[PDB]
Paper text:
During energy production in Desulfitobacterium hafniense, MtgA catalyzes the methyl transfer from methylcobalamin (Cbl‐CH3) to THF in the catabolism of glycine betaine (GB). Despite its lack of sequence identity with known structures, we could show that MtgA forms a homodimeric complex of two TIM barrels. The topology of each subunit is characterized by a funnel of eight parallel β‐sheets connected by α‐helices on the outside that form a complex of two perpendicularly oriented TIM barrels. The active‐site cavity is located inside the hydrophilic core of each barrel.
Herein, we present X‐ray structures of THF‐ and THF‐CH3‐bound MtgA that allow us atomic insights into the reaction trajectory of this catalyst. In contrast to substrate‐bound MtgA, the entire cofactor is defined in the MtgA:THF‐CH3 complex depicting extensive coordination within the amino acid environment in a rigid manner. The overall binding motif of the pterin ring remains similar to the substrate‐bound structure. However, the THF benzoate moiety is now involved in a π‐stacking network including Tyr230, Phe243, Phe251, and Trp272 on one side, as well as Tyr35 and His38 on the other. While the functional groups of the THF tail engage water‐coupled hydrogen bonding interactions with adjacent residues, the terminal γ‐carboxylate forms salt bridges with Arg236 that coordinate the cofactor in an extended conformation. Mutation of Arg236 to alanine resulted in impaired enzymatic activity, thus implying that fixation of the THF tail during methylation is involved in catalysis. Besides this fixation, the superposition of both ligand structures illustrates a rotation of the pterin moiety during the reaction of approximately 35°. In contrast, the benzoate group of THF‐CH3 displaces the carboxamide side chain of Asn227 by 2 Å (red double arrow). As planar sp2 hybridization would be expected in this position of the final product THF‐CH3, the X‐ray structure must depict a trapped protonated reaction intermediate. On the other hand, the WT MtgA:THF‐CH3 structure illustrates an intermediate that forms immediately after CH3 transfer from Cbl‐CH3 to THF.
Author numbering:
A (entry chain B): 3 to 158, 161 to 170, 177 to 306
B (entry chain A): 2 to 171, 178 to 306
């Protein structure tokens, strides 16, 4: 149980945040990532629409099974590609999504192209407000009327240098008109997932913002474990992805959506055990759509 | 160094168990000759496929060498004859310490008599377990054999809540000490998959207050979880990995992971959790007690 009153956000019906055991973990799957084989052209955003739709439908089916809500991590390396990717996601799921590029120019460029349909405001989450945020990003976010952003509380390493960042990143996000802050302290490698999780606990303990991370960042490149094949890679992946949840995290970017079938079953199990602690902490489940009431 | 109490680290025939989080790798305890282990043709006389049994022990040694997770064998028996034969086989076919494991105190004492005095028994045999309703005969049998390590099942129908379970110790530790036990592996018990969170909280209380190595059998309900197991591979294994790694994330020292056939996936999951926990040591100042650790092996 965290000292700070925990912020629970409703993003187009997706609840995220609260005391551990209050709400299920929100699972965030990546689509059109670098080397996503359904993409034939990452510059023009040419991709297999049948394959993309099949991933979105699988996500909805797994979400319905476990009670873990989903937000799509929509990656793009160009304004043209990310715009087409988001247009596809808008039409083919109801889920909220991350507008995700490592380039702030791609993110702002895509935002301008996507326009001012109120569906953008309701579903689009800015990924992310980072250490080197620009006044232009803040102004573009405000002009778009976005209310949720990922805050990437990461620099160049200890949890303390990550909190130092929160003018802070929260103050900057507030200037952009952001009211809902999804705090991501960043993940540098597999081993230091423990450092990230430490930063997550400070965020929830001190501020009560939802806290999460991308434990996916180095796991898929861990060839020594991945080369062992199934189910050895998947249980190692499960250990890494569930670790932040055991330390009270609210959301996980689990990497490529093709991994959803094993990720959801692992994360749902951790959620169920943590919610059983509610009986000792006095925490009330915020929803009956929870792994504890679904997976047994 | 999250626990207040100085943590006991035990050396059981070279297997280190205990410490502060990230100091030592998780000790993994696989079950052999469990009820409906299909390598047993006769559970009453203890007739088993010795080649299949040796293959499991050899696989355990290989996985242990790969990750650095040490191993103790959970030797289950339903009769004095069977458990005697199982322990005689384990003694000759591995160096690993082992749990003398029956739910019947009469079977545990019976097997102890059959095995009798042997410096190997005093070195490697761990009594599984000293329980709420222990008998004076058990304590006298344990002292006669000269055992120095026992599992303490800190569980009662009357003590479901974490604080209540550990209240049994002081008590169960006194009973063990009367039997000449010097090393206590505290197991608060696992009733179901969901209440592993309760078991893990009980492990935290033991380590916080007493500093005894704390562990459990998250295996107890996992293999009977039909809804998840019916999904098959790798869905059952990642769900089982979530259950088995959970106590370790909260500072537990050893896991009874169930049937040894599961060791290939269990070792890879637990080694990963151990590696991440040990990387925290750069911030707490805990010194890894050994270089034979997942953090230095799995990457
Ligand atoms: C960088 N990381 C991240 C983060 O840490 N925080 C936020 N908010 N957003 C993001 N977005 C992107 C990323 C999370 N998503 C990921 C992370 C990693 C991969 C990945 O490893 N892909 C593989 C190829 C796919 C594969 O091997 O299966 C690669 O080698 O690049 C794919 C997607
Ligand atoms: C009860 N539990 C336990 C415990 O909680 N604490 C201690 N110290 N020792 C023990 N020893 C026995 C047990 C831990 N080991 C286990 C737990 C469960 C199983 C198990 O579910 N076996 C089943 C399923 C076999 C299978 O489906 O693979 C069987 O039919 O035998 C097999 C072994």
């Amino acid at each position: 149980k965290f000292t700070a009153q925990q912020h629970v956000y409703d993003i187009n019906g997706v609840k995220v945040g609260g005391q551990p055991g209050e709400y299920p973990t929100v699972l965030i799957g990546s689509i059109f990532y670098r080397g996503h084989k359904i993409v034939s052209d990452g510059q023009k955003g040419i991709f297999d629409k049948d394959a993309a739709k099949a991933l979105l439908d699988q996500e909805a089916e797994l979400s319905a099974e476990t009670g873990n809500p989903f937000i799509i991590d929509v990656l793009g390396e160009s304004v043209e590609a990310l715009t087409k990717y988001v247009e596809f996601i808008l039409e083919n799921t109801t889920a909220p999504f991350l507008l995700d590029s490592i380039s702030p120019d791609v993110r702002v460029g895509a935002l301008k192209n996507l326009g001012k349909d109120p569906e953008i405001q309701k579903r689009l989450i800015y990924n992310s407000i980072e250490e080197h945020y620009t006044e232009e990003e803040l102004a573009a976010i405000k002009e778009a009327g976005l209310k949720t952003a990922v805050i990437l509380a990461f620099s160049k390493l200890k949890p303390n240098a990550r909190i130092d960042l929160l003018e802070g990143l929260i103050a900057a996000a507030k200037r952009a008109g952001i009211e809902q802050f999804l705090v991501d302290p960043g993940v540098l490698d597999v081993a230091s997932n423990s450092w990230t999780t430490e930063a997550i606990n400070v965020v929830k303990e001190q501020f009560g913002y939802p806290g999460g991370c991308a434990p996916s960042n180095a796991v898929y490149l861990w060839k020594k474990m991945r080369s062992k094949g199934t189910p050895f890679f998947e249980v190692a992946g499960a250990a890494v992805f569930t670790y932040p949840i055991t330390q009270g995290a609210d959301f996980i970017l689990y990497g490529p959506m093709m991994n959803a079938p094993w990720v959801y079953r692992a994360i749902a199990t951790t959620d169920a055990m943590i919610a059983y602690n509610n009986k000792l902490t006095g925490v009330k489940m915020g929803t009956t759509e929870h792994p504890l009431l679904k997976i047994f």
